[PDB]
Coordinates of C-alpha atoms (C1' of nucleotides) and ligand atoms in Angstrom, one line a residue:
Chain A
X1 CA 0.0 0.0 0.0
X2 CA 1.6 3.2 -1.2
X3 CA 2.6 5.8 1.4
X4 CA 0.4 8.9 0.9
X5 CA 2.8 11.7 0.2
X6 CA 2.1 15.4 -0.3
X7 CA 1.6 17.0 -3.7
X8 CA 3.6 17.6 -5.9
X9 CA 5.3 14.4 -7.1
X10 CA 8.9 14.1 -8.3
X11 CA 10.0 14.3 -11.9
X12 CA 9.0 11.2 -13.9
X13 CA 6.1 10.1 -11.6
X14 CA 3.2 8.2 -13.3
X15 CA 0.0 10.1 -13.4
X16 CA -3.6 9.1 -12.9
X17 CA -6.6 11.2 -13.6
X18 CA -10.4 11.1 -13.6
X19 CA -12.6 13.0 -16.2
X20 CA -16.2 13.9 -15.9
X21 CA -16.7 12.4 -19.4
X22 CA -14.5 10.6 -21.9
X23 CA -13.9 13.6 -24.3
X24 CA -10.8 15.5 -23.0
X25 CA -11.8 18.8 -24.6
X26 CA -15.2 18.6 -22.9
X27 CA -14.3 17.0 -19.6
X28 CA -14.0 18.4 -16.1
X29 CA -10.8 17.2 -14.5
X30 CA -12.2 15.8 -11.3
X31 CA -9.1 14.5 -9.7
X32 CA -5.3 14.2 -10.4
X33 CA -2.7 12.0 -8.7
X34 CA 0.7 10.6 -9.3
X35 CA 2.9 7.7 -8.2
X36 CA 6.6 7.0 -7.9
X37 CA 9.1 5.4 -5.6
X38 CA 6.4 3.7 -3.5
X39 CA 4.5 6.9 -3.0
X40 CA 1.1 8.2 -4.2
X41 CA 0.6 12.0 -4.4
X42 CA -3.0 13.2 -4.5
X43 CA -3.5 16.7 -5.7
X44 CA -5.7 18.9 -3.5
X45 CA -7.0 20.9 -6.5
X46 CA -6.4 19.1 -9.8
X47 CA -6.5 22.0 -12.3
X48 CA -3.8 24.0 -10.4
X49 CA -1.9 20.7 -9.9
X50 CA -1.6 20.3 -13.7
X51 CA 1.0 23.1 -13.7
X52 CA 3.4 21.1 -11.6
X53 CA 3.8 18.4 -14.2
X54 CA 6.4 18.4 -17.0
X55 CA 4.9 15.4 -18.8
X56 CA 1.8 13.2 -18.8
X57 CA 3.2 9.7 -18.2
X58 CA 0.6 7.0 -17.6
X59 CA -2.6 5.3 -18.9
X60 CA -4.4 7.5 -21.5
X61 CA -1.6 10.1 -21.3
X62 CA -2.7 11.8 -24.5
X63 CA -6.1 12.5 -23.2
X64 CA -4.8 14.4 -20.2
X65 CA -2.3 16.3 -22.4
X66 CA -5.2 17.4 -24.6
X67 CA -7.0 18.7 -21.6
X68 CA -3.8 20.5 -20.5
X69 CA -3.5 22.1 -23.9
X70 CA -7.1 23.2 -23.7
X71 CA -6.0 25.0 -20.5
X72 CA -3.0 26.6 -22.2
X73 CA -0.5 24.3 -20.6
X74 CA 2.3 22.5 -22.5
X75 CA 2.1 19.1 -20.9
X76 CA 3.3 16.6 -23.6
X77 CA 2.3 12.9 -23.3
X78 CA 5.2 10.5 -22.6
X79 CA 5.0 6.8 -21.8
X80 CA 1.6 5.2 -21.8
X81 CA 1.2 1.5 -20.9
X82 CA -1.8 1.3 -23.4
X83 CA 0.6 1.9 -26.3
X84 CA 2.9 -0.9 -25.1
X85 CA 0.0 -3.3 -24.7
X86 CA -1.4 -2.2 -28.0
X87 CA 1.8 -3.0 -29.8
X88 CA 2.1 -6.4 -28.0
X89 CA -1.5 -7.3 -29.2
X90 CA -3.7 -4.8 -30.9
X91 CA -6.8 -6.4 -29.3
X92 CA -5.5 -4.5 -26.2
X93 CA -7.8 -1.5 -26.6
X94 CA -9.2 -0.5 -23.2
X95 CA -7.7 0.3 -19.8
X96 CA -10.2 -2.1 -18.3
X97 CA -8.9 -5.0 -20.4
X98 CA -5.2 -4.0 -20.2
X99 CA -5.4 -3.7 -16.4
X100 CA -7.0 -7.1 -16.1
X101 CA -4.4 -8.7 -18.4
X102 CA -1.2 -7.2 -17.1
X103 CA -1.7 -6.8 -13.3
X104 CA -4.4 -4.6 -11.8
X105 CA -7.9 -3.1 -12.0
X106 CA -9.0 0.1 -13.7
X107 CA -11.1 1.9 -11.0
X108 CA -12.5 5.4 -10.8
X109 CA -10.0 7.0 -8.4
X110 CA -6.9 8.9 -9.6
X111 CA -4.5 7.6 -7.0
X112 CA -5.2 4.0 -7.9
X113 CA -5.0 4.9 -11.6
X114 CA -1.6 6.4 -10.9
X115 CA -0.5 3.4 -9.0
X116 CA -1.9 1.1 -11.7
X117 CA -0.1 3.1 -14.5
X118 CA 3.1 2.6 -12.6
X119 CA 2.7 -1.1 -12.1
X120 CA 1.4 -1.8 -15.6
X121 CA 4.3 0.1 -17.2
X122 CA 6.8 -2.0 -15.2
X123 CA 5.2 -5.2 -16.3
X124 CA 4.5 -4.3 -20.0
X125 CA 8.0 -2.9 -20.4
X126 CA 9.2 -6.3 -19.2
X127 CA 7.1 -8.1 -21.8
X128 CA 8.7 -5.9 -24.5
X129 CA 12.3 -6.6 -23.5
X130 CA 13.8 -8.1 -26.6
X131 CA 10.9 -7.3 -28.9
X132 CA 13.3 -5.0 -30.7
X133 CA 10.9 -4.1 -33.6
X134 CA 7.9 -3.5 -31.3
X135 CA 10.2 -1.3 -29.1
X136 CA 11.2 0.7 -32.2
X137 CA 7.6 1.2 -33.2
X138 CA 6.9 2.4 -29.6
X139 CA 9.9 4.8 -29.4
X140 CA 10.0 6.0 -33.1
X141 CA 6.2 5.9 -33.9
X142 CA 3.6 5.5 -31.3
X143 CA 5.0 7.4 -28.3
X144 CA 5.9 10.5 -30.3
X145 CA 2.8 10.2 -32.4
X146 CA 0.7 10.7 -29.2
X147 CA 2.2 14.2 -28.9
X148 CA 1.1 15.0 -32.5
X149 CA -2.4 13.7 -31.9
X150 CA -2.8 15.7 -28.7
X151 CA -2.0 18.9 -30.7
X152 CA -4.4 17.9 -33.5
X153 CA -7.2 17.2 -31.0
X154 CA -6.7 20.4 -29.1
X155 CA -6.4 22.6 -32.2
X156 CA -9.7 21.4 -33.8
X157 CA -11.1 22.5 -37.2
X158 CA -13.3 25.4 -38.2
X159 CA -16.8 24.8 -39.4
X160 CA -19.3 27.0 -41.2
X161 CA -22.1 26.7 -38.8
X162 CA -24.5 29.2 -40.3
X163 CA -24.1 27.4 -43.6
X164 CA -25.1 24.1 -42.1
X165 CA -28.0 25.6 -40.2
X166 CA -29.3 26.9 -43.5
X167 CA -28.7 23.5 -45.2
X168 CA -30.7 21.7 -42.5
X169 CA -33.8 23.7 -43.2
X170 CA -33.5 23.0 -47.0
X171 CA -32.9 19.3 -46.6
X172 CA -35.8 19.1 -44.1
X173 CA -38.3 20.3 -46.8
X174 CA -37.0 17.7 -49.3
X175 CA -37.2 14.9 -46.8
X176 CA -40.8 15.8 -46.3
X177 CA -41.4 15.7 -50.1
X178 CA -39.8 12.2 -50.2
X179 CA -41.6 10.8 -47.2
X180 CA -45.0 12.1 -48.2
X181 CA -44.5 10.3 -51.6
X182 CA -43.5 7.1 -49.9
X183 CA -46.6 7.1 -47.6
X184 CA -48.8 7.6 -50.6
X185 CA -47.1 4.9 -52.5
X186 CA -47.5 2.6 -49.5
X187 CA -51.1 3.7 -49.2
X188 CA -50.5 4.7 -45.6
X189 CA -48.0 6.4 -43.3
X190 CA -45.5 4.5 -41.1
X191 CA -42.2 5.1 -39.5
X192 CA -40.0 5.2 -42.6
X193 CA -36.9 5.2 -40.2
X194 CA -37.9 1.8 -38.9
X195 CA -36.5 -0.9 -41.1
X196 CA -38.8 -3.5 -39.5
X197 CA -41.8 -1.4 -40.5
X198 CA -40.4 -0.9 -44.0
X199 CA -39.7 -4.6 -44.3
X200 CA -43.4 -5.4 -43.8
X201 CA -44.5 -2.7 -46.3
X202 CA -42.1 -3.8 -49.0
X203 CA -42.4 -7.5 -48.9
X204 CA -45.7 -8.3 -47.2
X205 CA -48.0 -5.4 -48.3
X206 CA -46.5 -4.6 -51.7
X207 CA -45.3 -8.1 -52.2
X208 CA -41.9 -7.2 -53.5
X209 CA -39.4 -10.0 -53.9
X210 CA -37.2 -10.4 -50.8
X211 CA -33.6 -10.9 -51.9
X212 CA -31.4 -11.2 -48.8
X213 CA -31.5 -11.7 -45.1
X214 CA -30.0 -9.8 -42.2
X215 CA -27.0 -11.4 -40.5
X216 CA -28.0 -11.8 -36.8
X217 CA -31.8 -12.1 -36.9
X218 CA -32.7 -13.4 -40.4
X219 CA -35.0 -10.6 -41.2
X220 CA -35.6 -9.7 -44.9
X221 CA -33.0 -7.0 -45.6
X222 CA -33.9 -3.5 -46.7
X223 CA -30.3 -2.5 -47.4
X224 CA -29.3 -0.2 -50.2
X225 CA -27.8 -3.2 -52.0
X226 CA -31.2 -5.0 -51.8
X227 CA -33.1 -1.8 -52.7
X228 CA -30.8 -1.2 -55.7
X229 CA -31.9 -4.6 -57.1
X230 CA -35.6 -3.5 -56.8
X231 CA -35.6 0.1 -57.9
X232 CA -37.3 -1.1 -61.2
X233 CA -39.8 -3.3 -59.4
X234 CA -41.4 -0.3 -57.9
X235 CA -41.2 3.5 -57.8
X236 CA -41.4 3.6 -54.0
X237 CA -37.9 2.0 -53.9
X238 CA -36.3 5.0 -55.6
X239 CA -37.9 7.5 -53.2
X240 CA -36.8 5.4 -50.2
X241 CA -33.2 5.4 -51.3
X242 CA -33.3 9.1 -51.7
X243 CA -34.9 9.4 -48.3
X244 CA -32.1 7.3 -46.8
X245 CA -29.4 9.5 -48.2
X246 CA -30.8 12.7 -47.0
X247 CA -31.8 11.5 -43.5
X248 CA -28.5 9.7 -43.0
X249 CA -26.6 12.9 -43.9
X250 CA -28.9 15.2 -41.9
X251 CA -29.0 13.1 -38.8
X252 CA -25.2 12.2 -38.8
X253 CA -23.5 15.4 -39.9
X254 CA -25.7 18.4 -40.8
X255 CA -27.6 18.6 -37.5
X256 CA -25.1 17.3 -34.9
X257 CA -21.8 19.0 -35.9
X258 CA -22.8 22.6 -35.4
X259 CA -23.9 21.8 -31.8
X260 CA -20.3 20.6 -31.1
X261 CA -18.4 23.8 -31.5
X262 CA -16.3 24.4 -28.5
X263 CA -17.1 27.6 -26.6
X264 CA -13.4 28.4 -25.9
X265 CA -11.9 27.6 -29.3
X266 CA -14.8 28.2 -31.6
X267 CA -13.8 25.1 -33.4
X268 CA -14.8 21.4 -33.8
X269 CA -12.6 18.9 -31.9
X270 CA -12.4 15.1 -32.7
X271 CA -10.5 12.4 -30.9
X272 CA -7.8 10.4 -32.6
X273 CA -8.0 7.0 -30.8
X274 CA -4.5 5.5 -30.9
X275 CA -5.3 1.9 -29.5
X276 CA -8.6 1.1 -31.3
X277 CA -8.0 -0.9 -34.5
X278 CA -6.7 -4.4 -35.3
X279 CA -4.4 -3.2 -38.0
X280 CA -2.6 -0.1 -36.6
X281 CA -4.9 2.4 -38.2
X282 CA -6.1 5.4 -36.1
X283 CA -9.8 5.8 -35.6
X284 CA -11.7 9.0 -35.0
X285 CA -14.6 9.7 -32.6
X286 CA -16.8 12.2 -30.8
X287 CA -17.4 13.1 -33.5
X288 CA -15.8 10.9 -36.2
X289 CA -14.1 13.3 -38.6
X290 CA -12.8 10.4 -40.7
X291 CA -16.1 9.7 -42.5
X292 CA -17.2 13.2 -43.4
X293 CA -19.3 12.8 -46.6
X294 CA -17.8 13.5 -50.0
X295 CA -19.3 11.1 -52.6
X296 CA -22.8 12.7 -53.4
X297 CA -23.7 16.3 -54.2
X298 CA -25.3 16.8 -50.8
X299 CA -22.3 15.1 -49.2
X300 CA -20.0 17.5 -51.0
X301 CA -22.0 20.4 -49.7
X302 CA -21.4 19.1 -46.2
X303 CA -17.7 18.8 -46.8
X304 CA -17.5 22.4 -47.9
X305 CA -18.5 23.4 -44.4
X306 CA -15.0 22.5 -43.1
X307 CA -13.1 25.7 -43.7
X308 CA -9.8 27.4 -42.8
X309 CA -9.4 30.1 -40.1
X310 CA -9.6 33.6 -41.5
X311 CA -6.3 34.5 -43.2
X312 CA -5.3 30.8 -43.4
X313 CA -5.8 28.0 -46.0
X314 CA -6.4 24.3 -45.7
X315 CA -3.8 22.1 -47.3
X316 CA -5.0 18.5 -48.1
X317 CA -2.5 15.8 -48.9
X318 CA -3.5 12.3 -50.0
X319 CA -1.2 9.3 -50.8
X320 CA -1.8 7.9 -54.3
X321 CA -3.1 4.3 -54.5
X322 CA -1.3 3.7 -51.3
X323 CA -2.2 0.2 -50.4
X324 CA -1.4 -1.0 -53.9
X325 CA 2.1 0.5 -53.7
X326 CA 2.5 -1.2 -50.3
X327 CA 1.4 -4.5 -51.9
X328 CA 4.0 -4.1 -54.6
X329 CA 6.7 -3.7 -52.0
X330 CA 5.6 -6.5 -49.6
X331 CA 5.0 -9.0 -52.5
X332 CA 7.9 -8.2 -54.8
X333 CA 5.7 -8.5 -57.9
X334 CA 7.6 -7.1 -60.9
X335 CA 4.6 -6.4 -63.1
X336 CA 3.2 -4.3 -60.2
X337 CA 6.4 -2.6 -59.3
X338 CA 6.7 -1.7 -63.0
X339 CA 3.3 -0.2 -62.9
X340 CA 4.4 2.4 -60.3
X341 CA 7.8 3.1 -61.8
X342 CA 5.8 3.9 -64.9
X343 CA 3.3 6.2 -63.1
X344 CA 0.2 4.2 -64.2
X345 CA -3.2 4.5 -62.6
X346 CA -5.3 1.5 -61.8
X347 CA -8.3 3.3 -60.3
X348 CA -8.4 5.1 -63.6
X349 CA -7.7 2.0 -65.7
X350 CA -10.5 0.0 -63.9
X351 CA -12.7 3.1 -64.1
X352 CA -12.2 3.1 -67.9
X353 CA -12.8 -0.6 -68.3
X354 CA -16.0 -0.8 -66.2
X355 CA -17.4 2.3 -67.8
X356 CA -16.2 1.8 -71.4
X357 CA -14.7 5.3 -71.3
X358 CA -11.3 6.7 -72.4
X359 CA -9.0 7.5 -69.4
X360 CA -9.4 11.2 -70.5
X361 CA -13.0 11.1 -69.3
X362 CA -12.8 9.2 -66.0
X363 CA -14.1 11.9 -63.7
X364 CA -13.7 12.0 -59.9
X365 CA -16.9 9.9 -59.3
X366 CA -16.0 7.1 -61.7
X367 CA -12.6 6.7 -60.0
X368 CA -14.1 6.0 -56.6
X369 CA -16.3 3.3 -58.0
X370 CA -13.2 1.7 -59.4
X371 CA -11.6 1.8 -55.9
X372 CA -14.5 -0.3 -54.6
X373 CA -13.7 -2.8 -57.4
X374 CA -9.9 -2.9 -57.2
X375 CA -9.9 -3.1 -53.4
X376 CA -13.1 -5.2 -53.2
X377 CA -11.5 -7.7 -55.7
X378 CA -8.1 -7.7 -54.1
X379 CA -9.2 -8.5 -50.5
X380 CA -11.3 -11.4 -51.6
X381 CA -14.6 -10.3 -53.3
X382 CA -16.8 -13.0 -54.8
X383 CA -17.6 -13.3 -58.5
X384 CA -21.3 -13.2 -57.5
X385 CA -21.2 -10.0 -55.5
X386 CA -18.8 -8.5 -58.1
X387 CA -21.2 -9.3 -60.9
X388 CA -23.9 -7.4 -59.0
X389 CA -21.7 -4.5 -57.7
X390 CA -20.9 -3.3 -61.3
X391 CA -23.9 -4.8 -63.2
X392 CA -22.5 -7.5 -65.5
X393 CA -23.3 -11.3 -65.9
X394 CA -21.7 -13.6 -63.3
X395 CA -19.5 -15.1 -66.0
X396 CA -18.0 -11.7 -66.5
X397 CA -17.2 -11.2 -62.8
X398 CA -15.1 -14.4 -62.7
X399 CA -13.0 -13.0 -65.6
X400 CA -12.1 -9.6 -63.9
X401 CA -10.9 -11.3 -60.7
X402 CA -8.9 -13.8 -62.8
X403 CA -7.1 -11.2 -64.9
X404 CA -6.8 -8.9 -61.9
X405 CA -4.6 -11.5 -60.3
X406 CA -2.8 -13.2 -63.2
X407 CA -1.8 -9.8 -64.4
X408 CA -0.1 -9.4 -61.0
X409 CA 1.3 -13.0 -60.4
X410 CA 3.4 -13.0 -57.2
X411 CA 0.6 -11.4 -55.1
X412 CA -1.0 -14.8 -54.5
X413 CA 2.3 -16.3 -53.4
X414 CA 2.7 -13.5 -50.9
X415 CA -0.8 -14.2 -49.7
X416 CA 0.0 -17.9 -49.3
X417 CA 3.2 -17.1 -47.5
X418 CA 1.5 -14.7 -45.1
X419 CA -1.1 -17.2 -44.2
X420 CA 1.4 -20.0 -43.7
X421 CA 3.3 -17.8 -41.3
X422 CA 0.2 -16.6 -39.5
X423 CA -0.8 -20.3 -38.9
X424 CA 2.6 -21.2 -37.4
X425 CA 3.3 -18.2 -35.2
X426 CA -0.3 -17.2 -34.6
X427 CA 0.1 -13.6 -35.9
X428 CA 0.8 -11.7 -39.1
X429 CA 2.8 -8.5 -39.3
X430 CA 3.4 -5.2 -41.1
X431 CA 6.7 -4.2 -42.8
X432 CA 7.8 -2.7 -39.5
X433 CA 6.7 -5.7 -37.4
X434 CA 3.4 -4.5 -36.1
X435 CA 1.5 -7.7 -35.1
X436 CA -2.1 -8.8 -35.3
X437 CA -3.0 -12.2 -33.8
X438 CA -5.2 -14.2 -36.0
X439 CA -6.1 -17.5 -34.3
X440 CA -8.9 -18.6 -36.5
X441 CA -6.6 -19.5 -39.4
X442 CA -7.0 -23.2 -38.4
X443 CA -10.7 -23.0 -37.7
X444 CA -12.4 -26.2 -38.8
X445 CA -15.4 -24.3 -40.1
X446 CA -14.6 -23.2 -43.7
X447 CA -16.5 -19.9 -43.5
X448 CA -14.8 -18.9 -40.2
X449 CA -11.3 -19.9 -41.4
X450 CA -11.6 -18.2 -44.7
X451 CA -12.9 -15.0 -43.1
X452 CA -9.9 -15.2 -40.7
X453 CA -7.7 -15.5 -43.9
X454 CA -9.0 -12.3 -45.5
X455 CA -8.5 -10.5 -42.2
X456 CA -5.0 -11.9 -41.8
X457 CA -3.6 -11.2 -45.2
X458 CA -5.2 -7.7 -45.4
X459 CA -3.5 -6.6 -42.2
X460 CA 0.1 -6.3 -43.5
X461 CA -1.1 -4.1 -46.3
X462 CA -3.5 -1.8 -44.4
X463 CA -1.2 -1.8 -41.4
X464 CA 2.0 -1.0 -43.4
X465 CA 0.1 1.9 -45.0
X466 CA -0.9 3.0 -41.4
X467 CA 2.7 2.7 -40.1
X468 CA 3.9 4.8 -43.0
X469 CA 1.3 7.5 -42.4
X470 CA 2.0 7.6 -38.7
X471 CA 5.8 7.9 -39.3
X472 CA 5.1 10.7 -41.8
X473 CA 3.0 12.6 -39.2
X474 CA 5.8 12.2 -36.7
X475 CA 8.4 13.6 -39.1
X476 CA 6.2 16.4 -40.5
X477 CA 4.9 17.8 -37.2
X478 CA 8.0 19.6 -36.0
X479 CA 8.5 21.1 -39.5
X480 CA 5.0 22.6 -39.4
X481 CA 5.5 24.1 -36.0
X482 CA 8.6 25.8 -37.3
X483 CA 6.5 27.2 -40.2
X484 CA 3.6 28.4 -38.0
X485 CA 1.3 25.8 -39.6
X486 CA -1.0 23.2 -38.0
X487 CA -1.9 19.6 -38.5
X488 CA -5.7 19.2 -38.2
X489 CA -6.9 15.8 -39.4
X490 CA -5.8 12.4 -40.5
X491 CA -8.1 10.3 -42.7
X492 CA -5.9 7.1 -43.0
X493 CA -3.9 8.0 -46.1
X494 CA -4.7 11.8 -46.0
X495 CA -3.6 14.8 -43.9
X496 CA -5.4 18.1 -43.7
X497 CA -3.2 21.0 -42.5
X498 CA -4.0 24.6 -41.8
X499 CA -1.4 27.2 -42.9
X500 CA -1.0 31.0 -42.9
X501 CA -2.0 32.2 -46.4
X502 CA 1.5 33.5 -47.0
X503 CA 3.2 30.2 -46.2
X504 CA 0.5 27.8 -47.5
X505 CA 2.4 27.1 -50.7
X506 CA 5.7 26.4 -49.0
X507 CA 3.9 24.2 -46.4
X508 CA 2.2 22.2 -49.1
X509 CA 5.4 21.6 -51.0
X510 CA 7.3 20.6 -47.8
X511 CA 4.5 18.3 -46.6
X512 CA 4.3 16.6 -49.9
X513 CA 8.0 15.9 -49.8
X514 CA 8.0 14.6 -46.2
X515 CA 5.2 12.2 -47.0
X516 CA 6.6 10.9 -50.2
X517 CA 10.1 10.2 -48.7
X518 CA 8.9 8.9 -45.3
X519 CA 10.5 5.5 -45.8
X520 CA 11.6 4.7 -49.4
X521 CA 10.1 1.5 -50.8
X522 CA 10.7 -0.6 -54.0
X523 CA 8.2 1.8 -55.6
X524 CA 7.8 5.5 -55.1
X525 CA 5.1 7.0 -52.9
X526 CA 3.3 9.8 -54.6
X527 CA 1.1 12.4 -52.8
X528 CA -1.6 14.6 -54.4
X529 CA -1.7 18.0 -52.7
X530 CA -4.3 20.8 -52.8
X531 CA -4.9 24.1 -51.2
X532 CA -8.3 25.8 -50.6
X533 CA -10.5 27.7 -48.2
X534 CA -12.6 24.5 -47.6
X535 CA -12.0 20.8 -47.4
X536 CA -13.6 20.1 -50.7
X537 CA -11.9 22.8 -52.7
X538 CA -8.6 21.6 -51.3
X539 CA -8.9 18.2 -53.0
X540 CA -8.8 19.7 -56.5
Chain B
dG1 C1' -31.8 9.1 -18.1
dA2 C1' -28.7 4.8 -19.0
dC3 C1' -27.3 0.5 -21.6
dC4 C1' -27.1 -2.9 -25.7
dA5 C1' -27.9 -5.3 -30.2
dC6 C1' -29.1 -4.7 -34.7
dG7 C1' -29.4 -3.1 -39.3
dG8 C1' -27.9 0.2 -41.9
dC9 C1' -24.5 3.3 -44.0
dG10 C1' -20.9 7.3 -43.9
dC11 C1' -15.5 7.3 -44.9
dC12 C1' -10.7 5.0 -45.9
Chain C
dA1 C1' -27.5 -9.4 -49.4
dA2 C1' -23.8 -11.8 -51.7
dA3 C1' -15.8 -15.0 -50.2
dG4 C1' -10.6 -5.4 -45.4
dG5 C1' -10.8 -1.4 -41.5
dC6 C1' -13.6 1.8 -38.6
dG7 C1' -17.8 4.9 -35.6
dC8 C1' -22.7 6.9 -35.5
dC9 C1' -27.4 6.9 -36.6
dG10 C1' -32.5 5.5 -35.2
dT11 C1' -35.2 1.7 -33.7
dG12 C1' -36.3 -1.6 -30.6
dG13 C1' -36.0 -3.5 -26.1
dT14 C1' -34.5 -3.2 -21.6
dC15 C1' -33.3 -1.5 -16.8
Ligands
LIG1 O1 -10.9 -1.7 -48.9 N1 -10.0 -0.8 -48.8 O2 -8.9 -1.0 -48.4 C1 -10.4 0.5 -49.2 C2 -11.5 0.9 -49.8 C3 -11.4 2.3 -50.1 C4 -12.4 3.1 -50.8 C5 -13.1 3.8 -51.5 C6 -13.8 4.7 -52.4 C7 -15.1 5.2 -51.8 O3 -15.3 4.8 -50.5 C8 -15.1 6.8 -51.8 O4 -14.8 7.4 -53.0 C9 -10.2 2.7 -49.7 N2 -9.5 1.6 -49.2 C10 -8.1 1.7 -48.7 C11 -7.1 1.3 -49.8 C12 -6.7 2.7 -50.3 O5 -5.4 2.7 -50.8 C13 -6.7 3.5 -49.0 C14 -6.7 5.0 -49.1 O6 -8.0 5.4 -49.7 P1 -8.2 6.3 -51.0 O7 -7.2 7.5 -50.8 O8 -9.5 6.7 -51.2 O9 -7.6 5.4 -52.2 P2 -6.1 5.4 -52.8 O10 -5.1 5.9 -51.9 O11 -5.9 4.0 -53.3 O12 -6.3 6.2 -54.1 P3 -6.2 7.8 -54.5 O13 -5.2 7.9 -55.6 O14 -5.9 8.6 -53.3 O15 -7.6 8.2 -55.1 O16 -7.8 3.0 -48.3
LIG2 MG1 -5.2 8.1 -51.4
LIG3 MG1 -7.5 9.1 -49.1

DNA sequence: GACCACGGCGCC
DNA sequence: AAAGGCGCCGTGGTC
């Protein structure tokens, strides 16, 4: 039992803290404590006590650092046993689970959290002795990345609130036009947001053909993929699909985001969760700014609401065909390496083939559709689904996924090699040695085993791309600070920066070069960069 | 007011 | 719906 000692703690103590709510930019700091050398220090008043700390070292360090930044204090995050645990096994995503697994209990009291941070760090650091590549990821990627994310979180992004308020009222009237039409076509009103009520209308009352079933409960599905297949069978289907687009966008983005502007900053603040995915990707939450719309016209209007501070510009940088370049390097395939030493475009080539269109005329919306295909195909799509996704006979679907792989021969050999390894060692790994455990590779149920296989051989690709982006963020951040620029958002293979208008061009050039040269591969990494007043206009 | 499962769907 | 990775919505049901 730790000796209760007076605040403040010595240098290097492990911190524990309790927030009123999970979001650091919104939380009240209820209690603060620290632990070292067999002592626990409980702060009499936690906000004032923040100033005594040189570094947030402990569980969820980045969250406390964001809160410190909100208060104008430079309290960078350091060691965090969650990052160690996450690198050992990315299923380690919560403090509850990590505590249970590596020697304690996550409670609701700062002193115990500080003591727990200290014990867990000792034990996890032991487990990582001799895992030289994981230790490198920790010291060279994750631990410094957490500083970057804290600054992104605390900086936020500006949003055109008035513009969105106006858009809500317009979309509201159109939703009423669509719903009124649906209720007439059904002969009666019902809750069009209830997929159970819609299922009855569509397949019992109107006797439309039920195509597919839902996964867990076996209901007749009303998914867009099912509705797409029925849009000719009935005019109500078309209106329902339009109703779904508008209500999805209004309820998820248009209406909520303007209520989340922070009173102190006047900006919108997401969270970049650093121990949340099986592959090493970041995730974004509260709100998720990694799934802001972009595909449809209305979606594009929402994206335009993300704007630069007055007298600044946004700079948007996006890696080209990133996971395909990573695949070329991991596999060694020559026909593929060649494709990227020759600056060819496959999302354009596919978009030309599936549209019967010269590459000159593949517009931005055709190229996305081709990304569904190329990635859908590569990570294990079925001929049958493929035949449906791009509307061609099944026999055609088989051909695309046969030429898609014989054109690039040594991919399949890399797949087989990755699965064999994952079976023997129990995990697969990225170029840098990030691991994902995939136990079901020897499941005796084919469907389970084969799903495990698609998860296992995807991870080195998606996770290497994630390692590269994280490393680029870590390299780029100090260069932006020196140029008075900011890092705002990451969206997996994309960064959005904010720069003074007078240095925006120099920032964009520098950023592009840092990202392309992050870690040279057997193919070049290319980055598309754009500058604009709003997120959309900054992607050309 | 809280929680969860589910279907559904937004992005990468 | 049908052979990768996420988080948030409304419904429905529950406590
Ligand atoms: O299954 N996936 O793995 C996947 C699907 C999608 C998608 C999509 C299109 C629509 O959802 C919206 O239109 C993306 N991924 C992965 C692979 C890609 O490499 C990386 C970065 O995604 P993205 O930048 O969009 O593609 P990519 O870098 O290749 O090409 P660009 O040159 O920048 O256009 O995420
Ligand atoms: Mg890209
Ligand atoms: Mg992208």
